[PDB]
Amino acid sequence: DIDERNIFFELFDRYKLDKFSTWSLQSKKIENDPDFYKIRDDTVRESLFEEWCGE
């Protein structure tokens, strides 16, 4: 419940995604990384990205 989210943006910056371009080009990219599995809810993972994008 919003806490853990910033972890993924953090991961998401760690690998400098594009939080706007695609969810997965960024996430299928962070995929194999144990950090995509920080949260077992994939339905939350991509919601992360959108907040962090302009967070």
From Swiss-Prot:
Location in the cell: Nucleus
Residue span(s) of domain FF: 1-55
Chain coiled-coil ranges: none
Top-level division of the source organism's lineage: Eukaryota
Function: Component of the spliceosome involved in mRNA processing.
Subunit structure: Component of the precatalytic spliceosomal complex B. Interacts with PRP19.
Misc remark: Present with 1310 molecules/cell in log phase SD medium.
Protein name: Pre-mRNA-splicing factor URN1
Gene of this entry: URN1
Shown stretch of the complete protein: 212 to 266 of 465
